[PDB]
Amino acid sequence: RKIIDTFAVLTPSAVSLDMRKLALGLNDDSSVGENTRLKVMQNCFEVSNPLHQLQTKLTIAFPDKSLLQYDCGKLQKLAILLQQLKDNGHRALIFTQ
Amino acid sequence: VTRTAAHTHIKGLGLDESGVAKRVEGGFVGQIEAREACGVIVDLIKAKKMSGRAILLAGGPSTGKTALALAISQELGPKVPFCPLVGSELYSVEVKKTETLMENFRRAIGLRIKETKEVYEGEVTELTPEDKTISHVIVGLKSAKGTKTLRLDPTIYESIQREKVSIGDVIYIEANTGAVKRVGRSDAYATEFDLETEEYVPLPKGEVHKKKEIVQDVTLHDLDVANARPQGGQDVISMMGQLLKPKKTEITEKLRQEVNKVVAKYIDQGVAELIPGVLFIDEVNMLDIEIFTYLNKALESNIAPVVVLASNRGMTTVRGTEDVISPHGVPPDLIDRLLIVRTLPYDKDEIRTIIERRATVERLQVESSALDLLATMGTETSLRYALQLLAPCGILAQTSNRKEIVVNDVNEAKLLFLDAKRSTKILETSANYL
Amino acid sequence: ISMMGQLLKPKKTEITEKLRQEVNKVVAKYIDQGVAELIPGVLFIDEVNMLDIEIFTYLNKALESN
Amino acid sequence: TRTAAHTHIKGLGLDESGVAKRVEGGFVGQIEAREACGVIVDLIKAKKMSGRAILLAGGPSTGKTALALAISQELGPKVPFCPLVGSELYSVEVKKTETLMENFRRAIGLRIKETKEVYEGEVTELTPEDAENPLGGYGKTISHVIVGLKSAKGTKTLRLDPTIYESIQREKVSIGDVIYIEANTGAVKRVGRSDAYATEFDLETEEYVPLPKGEVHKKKEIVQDVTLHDLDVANARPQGGQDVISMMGQLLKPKKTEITEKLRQEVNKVVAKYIDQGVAELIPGVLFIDEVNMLDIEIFTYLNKALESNIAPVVVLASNRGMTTVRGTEDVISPHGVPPDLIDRLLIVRTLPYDKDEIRTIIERRATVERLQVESSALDLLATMGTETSLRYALQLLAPCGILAQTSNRKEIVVNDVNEAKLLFLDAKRSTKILETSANYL
Amino acid sequence: KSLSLIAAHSHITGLGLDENLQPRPTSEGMVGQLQARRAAGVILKMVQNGTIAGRAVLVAGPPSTGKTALAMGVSQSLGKDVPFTAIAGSEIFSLELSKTEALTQAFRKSIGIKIKEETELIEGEVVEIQIDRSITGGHKQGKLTIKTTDMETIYELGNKMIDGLTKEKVLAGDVISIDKASGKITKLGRSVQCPEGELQKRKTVVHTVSLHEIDVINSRTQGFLALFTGDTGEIRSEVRDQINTKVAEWKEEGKAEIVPGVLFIDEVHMLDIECFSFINRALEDEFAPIVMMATNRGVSKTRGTNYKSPHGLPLDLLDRSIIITTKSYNEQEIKTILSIRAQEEEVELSSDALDLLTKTGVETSLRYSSNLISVAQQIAMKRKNNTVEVEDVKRAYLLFLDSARSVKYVQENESQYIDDQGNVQISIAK
Amino acid sequence: LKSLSLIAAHSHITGLGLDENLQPRPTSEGMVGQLQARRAAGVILKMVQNGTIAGRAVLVAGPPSTGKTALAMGVSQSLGKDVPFTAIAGSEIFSLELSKTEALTQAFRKSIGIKIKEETELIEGEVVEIQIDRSITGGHKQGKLTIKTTDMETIYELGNKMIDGLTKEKVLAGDVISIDKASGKITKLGRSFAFVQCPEGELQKRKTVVHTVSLHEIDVINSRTQGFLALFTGDTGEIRSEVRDQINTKVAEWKEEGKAEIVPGVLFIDEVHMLDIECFSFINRALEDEFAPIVMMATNRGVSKTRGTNYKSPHGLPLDLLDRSIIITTKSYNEQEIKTILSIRAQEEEVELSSDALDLLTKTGVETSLRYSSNLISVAQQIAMKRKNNTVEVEDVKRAYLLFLDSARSVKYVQENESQYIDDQGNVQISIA
Ligand SMILES: Nc1ncnc2c1ncn2[C@@H]1O[C@H](COP(=O)(O)OP(=O)(O)O)[C@@H](O)[C@H]1O
Ligand SMILES: Nc1ncnc2c1ncn2[C@@H]1O[C@H](COP(=O)(O)OP(=O)(O)O)[C@@H](O)[C@H]1O
Ligand SMILES: Nc1ncnc2c1ncn2[C@@H]1O[C@H](COP(=O)(O)OP(=O)(O)O)[C@@H](O)[C@H]1O
Ligand SMILES: Nc1ncnc2c1ncn2[C@@H]1O[C@H](COP(=O)(O)OP(=O)(O)O)[C@@H](O)[C@H]1O
Ligand SMILES: [Mg+2]
Ligand SMILES: [Mg+2]
Ligand SMILES: [Mg+2]
Ligand SMILES: [Mg+2]
């Protein structure tokens, strides 16, 4: 789970919704019976798959959390100096506007 | 710190506003006429008036042809799509080469589109299903600055229930694509359990419903395959659809025509803007006769973008033909549609300046004698040999702790590493096919 | 699973001789019962020179079938 | 009782650390060849080398495959052994390199030994044991669970920790039903009702099992073996009942795919971790390839690369060709069709043709194997025929003489029967002469 | 609409002819080739006649001498609503489809079927919609009011249309269309548009569908998806026989009519011998669109065979076909063609520059000049003068090489270039 | 720690054996001789360790049985871990499912690794009391547990998921358990008194974990939703180039932001002498990109014909790559060097050799191929094992030599008996008479 979460980035930039249902042959109007298609969607509803994590990761690009310190130039060079002061046993004061 | 691979010392053509090419500018020396022609082609590309132009540049090995092909793309900027390609790549096992060529053609031309999206987020207060069929669900999304209730599509209901969310979990839902993703449990329940795996997140800032404008760019072929085959989706139905036909398939011209029609409709409203690109094919001599035959018709298409070709061969037989001989291995019925840009070998001073610039970008210092020896070697065996040998000289200088390249280091590099000529000489006089 | 199979394109496959034998058996039983009648047909092939030697060889075995 | 050009070879016919005897294990002659084969057998039994390749070359019908069968027999059933043909590698589904690597991995085996303590028997009774809770409370507290086990020639009752309650409730086993309990792992497994309760009902859908024999407490050691390729294919191939991939395996056709190297190295790592504890025991096998002259030059190159691996087992190659051209190259000429670089990486074992007396001994031993009796004159005639046409023709002709003797109600073959066989059945040379002398396209 | 920047055949539109099938010297971007133009017009009238099908016509001529232009003009003059398939010869070589099957699909794609269906529908601005839940008195009562320019009345909704209307959110005041027979809802916009009159009107909808599309639709559970994904995969022959029989019954019943379109195959010379043998039979059946081909090569080796055949095609196929020959262009025609191309590209050419360009085109090729015209313009706005002068043309001529000049330079400097044997020299000295 | 290891051809070679001056020692780290070749290999290794350059292709040459593959194996050994190293054969890329260009691209991508590190808090202590409050047919349940270290001891109240976590695997008071709070993984470090000392120091500590994954894995993962299975089953086909471009941009911006660092590796191709012209043409352009691993190529062929072309090219490769490649040559082996190689092989296989036996083995490996003796040594030891003595003698080696044929001797025997063997024309004589 950790590797998949960390290393899944790309998304299918071009998509066409409602094409999935047409491709699977199930929708409001088709050549299949209403009861049969209803049973098919019920089964798909109650069938569990282990790929849901990857499905969500690829479908939407979650901003995650570690990007907070990566999008700021000051934050990039601040953690290193904080760690350096930590190893030397020095306390720090921060002033903001 | 920085990585350099036979390039990145070139930043552009470095031409003047009148089209005059400077002798030394933008990591370039010589080839003034070729650079001027390439700048003319760049201006024609930026014009966007006419599509389907085909030019090729023919020259000897190590004549900067690929350097020019990279320089034109650099000048065009990242905004204009550029599709590098090699001749061997057209042979695909999954689908025929013609489909791959047409797919690359469609990839070459880009498109810029702007759209607005509706975003809902907040803390969940209740999950009420409306229940033969999967019923809708009423969600109690609550933000810090507002609260409202929404009715969700049963597919979205399945997706959100697959996230295993509950009351008090902050979720994110996209109104356009139906994407559902739960960031985590609300910070209010942080102290509910002294030991629970689930992480806690603060309440979302702002109201639940948000709108924004995005001008993201999508190539024509991207939406072409979007219409052709299904793509990702959190529901199980999407997984079934995209697993039913995993192997790629060739696209009929009917879908391409419909894509063109809908793109024209989009551009009529001013929502979209068209930006044609350039397709680059290297080692074009590696293609077969049938590929050129199809390219003859492909170039005559109205939407086919401008394609640049490169080859280094003289009187050679075209692949797939037992007797047809034509320059650069390009059939005569195709060279008529082409514009040929000649390329010429460099001189000793040009080689020396190239080596100087390559050393400068490599962050190395070379003495005058070492530079002269490198120039003599380049004029004696090949231009590429000095560039390849540059790094071992730096390594040897590092080993000896000296900070500059001397004659001893380059001599040792010559002794250690052999060029093609010395290797062939050894091969001629060898015991058992050494 | 049957719906998914129906969605997939029909690819030709090498029908085994056993299946043809069972079909022949049931057809013979029905024609003996008089519920059906078998009518031989005609197959026409044009430009047979385009055939490979393997197909020519297999034609000899095929023409000797019942 | 069926034989096919083999099954009369029983081992290499060697002796206790010495030169092989003249006649032993259905082997006659070629003492040096089977001596070298026994040396190779000792080398593989050492189980220290890796990627050791040998090749045997000789004329047709010189026991080339017989020696491989003999070493396979000598190694034993536990040691893996994968026969193969030169034409096996050409697979439509996947590239030849993947098939060769898969065969290489299938050659290597692995043995697993485990010991388990079993407490089994009929459930006499189930009685919880009450005790005071460490923390003050009015609820009932159980410290132990008493279970009685009854078996043939012994019964016993066990006092166990109360956590067995979940397992005993799950197994839905109540009274007078045989159960299985592991000592340290815990848990229980219902195996079936006691046979004594079968008559209690007129009809029953549930089988009744007899009570376990011997003591209720048992200590049995179990040994299981499996090759590395089976582990790799099990790791790669998904399994499951209702997960989407499970019936995505259905409604489709499972086909061989190029297994990645990361999966193989992960399997190797876990195997090493388990073998460091002494539970596992790796045993290398032997891969046998026939008509190696038919391998492609690319396959030869990949063999050259793979023979230097640290897990490659011992391979044995056979070829009956001499100064020929390797397939895939019209100009390269090398002995036995093997490229010279590959020949440089292995050892060549010669094979020599047999003599008239050896041919006669082979024929008589085969006749003894086939359970039919010949006369001395008929045996000599057959030996002369074999020395004239070929050994294999004489070997094949044996059964028709037996049939002809059976038709004449005779128990032993005579000269007349072998003459009838020779006139009815032709060999290669007479057929070739007929082809030369006939112009009817025959 | 029909977005396109510039095509080598964009200038030509609709060929050019008169009521007596006499080609004009210059009509709608077509210059010269009088005999070829008249033959093309004859073929176009044959196609529009529709009485004769399954005939083969061949187009022959030197490269870059009005060959694809003739086919483009024929297609343009044929107009819309008539099938026209233009495929290169190398396109049929598919890895997943047999060449015979691809050829059959191409043949079937060129015959279009028109089917007419009559439907009733209502439309207009909707002003009131009321929907109620089930009571013992009534399972579902629903009243809606659609107002047009001339009419405004209320209909009664019997359950099913109530569910249909509740399926998608509908707000009063927007133009919608309701198809009574199909029972579907179509929204035409918001009241942006205006109504016209009676709510219910009589009209027929005509659909143009090719035979190949019908076969693909009837060949699968959801065949119409394969119309775009291209995974038809060797449709069974009995399906095609059944489709042919059904089409015959429909034609005899008047429910549909056939449009014998045109199939154009370019670079036929490289097609395999099996394809030609199959075409021999395919051209002699009942449903067969007209077939036109264009081969540049002459007296070459047919692909798939060792011997050389005239025109690159087998003799029997040539017997099955009719040959049309084009002639090389002349200087007075070349200058007119270049002027037309410049007008199409919106480039202003001086008289001396045009004469020099015509001389160069006569010397080397027409395509070279028709490519130089555009590139000279970049130099033109480089000098910031709209008109193109002789200096710009000469600069373009020296900057971009010709085939003959490149060949001569290669012959002079074959040492620098890679030889056929692979020999090459990179070093300058020694 | 130690993977599946058996005595193979290159087991003894572990490292180049070079000094701080990059001057090879005569005999060190299993490498003997080839001073200039070893020095060049050390230069290449230092260049790879520098990691500031890309797209450098080096071709090694020499006759068969010279040590080029041994040199590459030593280079890999000296490279150490954490740096990807891919060794493939020439014929491996001829895939029936994947295009040769695609296979070459995958091989190139596999050689580059990416390192991402993160901080994960850890809680480890000794269990004192476990209390789970459940309800039969009640649904909601509660739980409480007490953890202990040497310095501190507190009671922890568990969440709903923690109840399942501690109930799926049996957890008792006598167990020593470390659990990651964010991950939720439960680990049983060992079993205390019912023999592992109780954890010391603070109960909760924060530790850093780094994940290393090659870039090709990122391409496979992002290619399709079901592409993760292809990371093991190897069933992936024709990944879209747009995916590769987006991945390259993401990697570049990640390196710029310092979130992740890239570790360039080495791609080694064995027997490159056989390949197609398409592969060489693709390599010509693939070597020029920014993310190009340093490529080592081996070829023992002479002036021969490149596959896919009629003409014969020097060194078995077309001049295009030879122009942009660096050639390292290797020389034959001296008799003393062969003796040292045989001695080091014996030491690797712990086989005792007689001095006279070693000298005759050296002489026969000088006359014949070195590999002949390097194989005969094990058989000689096996034969000597039958004599119940742990030392190989001259007689044992002579018996092994007469038992197993060399290439030249076998060729002579075949030539003398060409009738017995199968002729290239197909004729063969089997009748003795
Ligand atoms: N004008 C120039 N300035 C700098 N480098 C050049 C120039 N011309 C050629 N080169 C170098 O020569 C090499 C070969 O050029 P390229 O076109 O990439 O391949 P080739 O010419 O061999 O097909 C390039 O790596 C480039 O760095
Ligand atoms: N020592 C032996 N004793 C008995 N039979 C033998 C002996 N050697 C060879 N054979 C016979 O030779 C046959 C093996 O033929 P073989 O030489 O393997 O064919 P090929 O030369 O095509 O590999 C076996 O059927 C066996 O009966
Ligand atoms: N009659 C014409 N009028 C205008 N342009 C023409 C005419 N004939 C040919 N062309 C030009 O020639 C090009 C078509 O070349 P074509 O003769 O089809 O080549 P090929 O003979 O190789 O098929 C078009 O771009 C068109 O501009
Ligand atoms: N310097 C060396 N140290 C150790 N072994 C060597 C050395 N040189 C050559 N060898 C041995 O020579 C054999 C052949 O060398 P290698 O390069 O692996 O294959 P080849 O040279 O035959 O292509 C190897 O098994 C290797 O053990
Ligand atoms: Mg180049
Ligand atoms: Mg055999
Ligand atoms: Mg044309
Ligand atoms: Mg080697």
Q: For the residues of B80-127, what is the DSSP string, one character each?
A: S-EEEEEGGGG--SSS-HHHHHHHHHHHHSEEEE-EEEEEEEEE---E
Are B11 and B74 spatial neighbours (Cβ–Cβ below 8 Å)?
A: yes
Rounded distance, CA B87 to CA B100, Å? Answer: 11
3 state DSSP class of F78: helix
In order, the DSSP letters of B369-408 are: HHHHHHHHHHHHT-HHHHHHHHHHHHHHHHHTT-SSB-HH
Rounded distance, CA F429 to CA E239, Å? Answer: 60
Rounded distance, CA E230 to CA E97, Å? Answer: 10
Rounded distance, CA F144 to CA F135, Å? Answer: 15
Nearest-CA neighbor of F59 among F74, F73, F40? F40
Give D303 Cα–ligand 2 centroid separation in angstroms.
Answer: 27
Q: Is B179 within 8 Å of A60 when comparing Cβ atoms?
A: yes
Nearest-CA neighbor of D33 among D338, D288, D352, D365? D352
Q: Which of B19, B299, B314 sits opposite E419 (nearest CB)?
A: B314
Q: Which of B158, B235, B243 to mutate to test the interface with D (most CBs of D within 10 A)?
A: B243
What is the helix (H) or strand (E) element at residue B234, kind and residue range? none
3 state DSSP class of B44: helix
Q: Which value, to the nearest 10 degrees, does the dihedral of the CA atoms of residues B346, B347, B349, B350 take?
A: 0
Nearest-CA neighbor of B334 among E73, E403, E419? E403
User: What would you measure as the largest C-alpha separation in chain C, in angstroms?
Assistant: 45
Is residue E263 in contact with ligand 3, taking CB distance under 6 Å?
Answer: no
3 state DSSP class of E175: strand
Give F57 Cα–ligand 4 centroid separation in angstroms.
Answer: 22
Query: Tokens representing B242?
Result: 């995209």
Phi/psi for F71 (5° steps) reads: -60, -45
3 state DSSP class of B133: coil
Q: Let me know if F259 is exposed, middle or buried by CB neighbors in 10 A (0-12, 13-18, 19+).
A: middle
Q: Let me know if F147 is exposed, middle or buried by CB neighbors in 10 A (0-12, 13-18, 19+).
A: buried
The response to whether D65 counts as a known ligand-binding position is yes
Are D68 and D315 spatial neighbours (Cβ–Cβ below 8 Å)?
A: no
Are F302 and F316 spatial neighbours (Cβ–Cβ below 8 Å)?
A: yes
Query: Tokens representing B133?
Result: 């069929």
Task: Find the ligand nearest to B29 CA.
Answer: 1
Q: Which of C47, C49, C51 to mutate to test the interface with E (most CBs of E within 10 A)?
A: C47
Count CB neighbours of C50 within 10 A: 13
The response to whether D335 counts as a known ligand-binding position is no
3 state DSSP class of D28: strand
Count CB neighbours of F190 within 10 A: 11
Which one-letter amino acid corresponds to residue E38? Answer: R
Pocket test for ligand 4, best of F11, F297, F341, F348 (most atoms within 8 A of CB): F341
3 state DSSP class of D393: helix
Rounded distance, CA F100 to CA F93, Å? Answer: 6
User: Residues of F with CB below 8 A from B91's CB?
Assistant: 99-101, 278
What is the helix (H) or strand (E) element at residue D124, kind and residue range? strand D109-130
Q: Where are the alpha helices (DSSP H) in C1-66?
A: 2-7, 17-33, 53-63
Task: Find the ligand nearest to F321 CA.
Answer: 1
Query: Tokens representing E2?
Result: 């029909």
Are B248 and E221 spatial neighbours (Cβ–Cβ below 8 Å)?
A: no
Q: Which of A55, A58, A64 to mutate to test the interface with B (most CBs of B within 10 A)?
A: A55
User: Residues of C with CB below 8 A from D251's CB?
Assistant: 1, 4-5, 8
Looking at ligand 4, which residue's alpha carbon is closest to its atom 3?
A: F31
- Find where tokens 């029997």 sit: E316
Neighbours of chain F (3+ CB pairs under 8 A): A, B, D, E
Nearest-CA neighbor of B119 among B180, B41, B165, B164? B180
The residues facing D145 across adjacent strands are D128, D160
Q: Where are the alpha helices (DSSP H) in F224-313?
A: 227-233, 241-257, 277-286
Helices B65-76, B32-47: axis angle to 10 degrees equals 40
Count CB neighbours of F394 within 10 A: 15
Rounded distance, CA B199 to CA B350, Å? Answer: 63
Q: Which residues of B participate in the annotated binding site for ATP?
A: 59-66
Can you give the C-alpha Rg of chain A in angstroms? 24
Tell me, what DSSP letter sits at residue D17?
T
Rounded distance, CA D346 to CA D348, Å? Answer: 7
Rounded distance, CA A21 to CA A41, Å? Answer: 10
- Chain breaks of chain C after residues with C–N above 2.5 Å: none
Rounded distance, CA E6 to CA B300, Å? Answer: 9
Rounded distance, CA E20 to CA E259, Å? Answer: 25
Determination technique used: cryo-EM
Count CB neighbours of F160 within 10 A: 17
Nearest-CA neighbor of D108 among D187, D225, D276? D225
Can you give the C-alpha Rg of chain C in angstroms? 17
CATH number for the domain running over E331-410: 1.10.8.60
Nearest-CA neighbor of F211 among A78, A68, A5, B1? A5
Rounded distance, CA E86 to CA B157, Å? Answer: 48
Give B60 Cα–ligand 5 centroid separation in angstroms.
Answer: 9
In chain A, what is the straight-line distance between the N-terminal and C-terminal CA atoms, in Å?
41
Rounded distance, CA B221 to CA B201, Å? Answer: 39
Please report, for residues B179, E211, E287, the alpha-carbon distance to residue E282 in angstroms, rounded to integers and kept in the order given.
52, 15, 9
Are B143 and B121 spatial neighbours (Cβ–Cβ below 8 Å)?
A: yes
Query: Tokens representing E36?
Result: 């070829």
Q: Which residues of F participate in the annotated binding site for ATP?
A: 62-69
In order, the DSSP letters of F161-193 are: HHHHHHHHS---TTEEEEEETTT--EEEEEE--
Rounded distance, CA F254 to CA F218, Å? Answer: 13
In chain B, what is the straight-line distance between the N-terminal and C-terminal CA atoms, in Å?
40
Phi/psi for F120 (5° steps) reads: -125, 125
Chains D and E touch (3+ CB pairs under 8 A): no
Q: Which CATH architecture has domain F335-414?
A: Orthogonal Bundle (1.10)
- Chain breaks of chain F after residues with C–N above 2.5 Å: 194
Q: What share of chain B is helix, strand, coil (3-state, %, to 5)?
A: 40, 20, 40
Q: Is A31 within 8 Å of E225 when comparing Cβ atoms?
A: no
Q: Which CATH architecture has domain F117-209?
A: Beta Barrel (2.40)
Please give the number of the atom of ligand 3 that sits closest to the Cα of E341.
Answer: 27
Residues having CB closer than 6 A to ligand 1 are: B 6, 27-31, 61-67, 312, 354
Rounded distance, CA D30 to CA D44, Å? Answer: 21
E256–chain C nearest CA distance, Å: 29
Q: Tell me, rounded to whole angstroms, the distance of Cα E398 from its chain centroid.
A: 37
Pocket test for ligand 4, best of F69, F338, F370 (most atoms within 8 A of CB): F69
Cβ burial F20-48 (10 Å sphere, 16+ → b, else e):
eebebeeeebbbbbbebbbbbbbbbbbbb
Rounded distance, CA B184 to CA B165, Å? Answer: 9
Can you give the C-alpha Rg of chain B in angstroms? 30
Rounded distance, CA F6 to CA B169, Å? Answer: 55
Count CB neighbours of A33 within 10 A: 9
Please report, for residues B48, E162, E349, E380, E391, the alpha-carbon distance to residue E385 in angstroms, rounded to integers and kept in the order given.
19, 69, 11, 6, 12
Angle at D80 between CA D76 and CA D82, to 5 degrees: 115
Rounded distance, CA D341 to CA D412, Å? Answer: 54
Give F67 Cα–ligand 4 centroid separation in angstroms.
Answer: 3
Bin B206: left if φ > 0, else alpha if -120 < ψ < 50, else beta. left
C62–chain D nearest CA distance, Å: 22
Phi/psi for F424 (5° steps) reads: -60, -35
Are B165 and B173 spatial neighbours (Cβ–Cβ below 8 Å)?
A: no
Rounded distance, CA B25 to CA E28, Å? Answer: 49
User: Residues of D with CB below 8 A from F11's CB?
Assistant: 310
Residues having CB closer than 6 A to ligand 2 are: D 5, 26-29, 60-66, 318, 320, 362
Name the E strands within E44-197: 56-60, 84-88, 111-131, 142-147, 152-157, 174-179, 184-190
Are F243 and A2 spatial neighbours (Cβ–Cβ below 8 Å)?
A: no
Residues in chain D: 442
Are F114 and F218 spatial neighbours (Cβ–Cβ below 8 Å)?
A: yes
Give F325 Cα–ligand 5 centroid separation in angstroms.
Answer: 14
Q: How many helices (H) and strands (E) does chain F have?
A: 14, 16
The residues facing F177 across adjacent strands are F125, F188
The residues facing B311 across adjacent strands are B58
User: Residues of C with CB below 8 A from A25's CB?
Assistant: 3, 7
Q: Kind of pairing, strands F261-263 and F113-133?
A: antiparallel
Which one-letter amino acid corresponds to residue D283? Answer: I
In chain E, what is the straight-line distance between the N-terminal and C-terminal CA atoms, in Å?
63
Rounded distance, CA B360 to CA B377, Å? Answer: 19
Bin D244: left if φ > 0, else alpha if -120 < ψ < 50, else beta. alpha
Rounded distance, CA D338 to CA D325, Å? Answer: 9
Tell me, what DSSP letter sits at residue E271?
S
3 state DSSP class of B333: helix
Helices D96-107, D228-236: axis angle to 10 degrees equals 120
Give D35 Cα–ligand 6 centroid separation in angstroms.
Answer: 19
Counting Cα atoms < 13 Å in the Cβ hemisphere of B339 gives 26
Residues in chain F: 433
Looking at ligand 2, which residue's alpha carbon is closest to its atom 23?
A: D64
User: Per the CATH hierarchy, to which homologous superfamily does domain E116-205 belong?
Assistant: RuvBL1 DNA/RNA binding domain (2.40.50.360)
Can you give the C-alpha Rg of chain F in angstroms? 30
Q: Which of E420, E422, E426 sits opposite F318 (nearest CB)?
A: E422
Q: Kind of pairing, strands D208-209 and F304-305?
A: unpaired
Are F379 and D44 spatial neighbours (Cβ–Cβ below 8 Å)?
A: no
The residues facing A77 across adjacent strands are none
In order, the DSSP letters of B159-170 are: HHHHTT--TTEE
The residues facing E205 across adjacent strands are E117
The response to whether D86 counts as a known ligand-binding position is no
Q: Let me know if D433 is exposed, middle or buried by CB neighbors in 10 A (0-12, 13-18, 19+).
A: exposed
Q: Which value, to the nearest 10 degrees, does the dihedral of the CA atoms of residues A11, A16, A22, A24 take?
A: 0
Chains F and A touch (3+ CB pairs under 8 A): yes
